[PDB]
């Protein structure tokens, strides 16, 4: 699809199985979410966002359905007040911004 | 133009007489950039994301140029650690996201 920005651009994607809105954000070099169950370990990693660094946890190969194409991603679980696609999935599915 | 997303997508804005590097980001609702003296008044505002809750001064109809058009617009001025354009501007300039 093609999708102005006059509202948020937010999609439904599978994450581990949940079903989970998200806001494709191009300012987001990662994905975060809050409070995904997800298993196995993971690893600290620490995010800069407009309010300081945060810790988060790095959950990786994590299966992941997005518009429809079914892939392995990074995913970051962790207090972000907006659950967010970043450039790492973006990528992954070949989406652009036009102008 | 059509712009992939292995890359941060930064274009230069002009604003304020000056040069600024600013990331294309379909992640937030508002502009806000970091170092930037514009003239008048402006309305309080607090901006939230990774990190908590950011004061920022909101200016209204701030001339500016991005991607050859001039346009006026709001910009949030703020102690962000990177600017960015936010949905504002990008329908301002017909930005899209394709996937
Ligand atoms: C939905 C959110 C998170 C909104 N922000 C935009 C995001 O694009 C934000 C842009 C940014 C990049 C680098 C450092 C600082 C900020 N990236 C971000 O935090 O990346 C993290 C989360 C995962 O990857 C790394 S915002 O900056 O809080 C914001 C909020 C309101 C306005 N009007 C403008 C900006």
Redesign the interface.
Known sequence: ??????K??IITIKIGGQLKDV???????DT?LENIDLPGKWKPKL????????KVRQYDHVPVEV?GHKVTTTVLVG????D?I??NL??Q???????
Chains 1, 2 share one sequence.
Request: aromatic letters at 8%; hydrophobic letters at 45%.
């Open positions: 699809p093609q999708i102005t920005l006059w948020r651009p806001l494709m954000d191009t300012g987001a070099d975060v995010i800069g966002g407009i309010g300081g660094f945060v518009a207090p972000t007040p907006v967010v970043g450039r973006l990528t599915i070949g989406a652009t911004l036009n102008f």
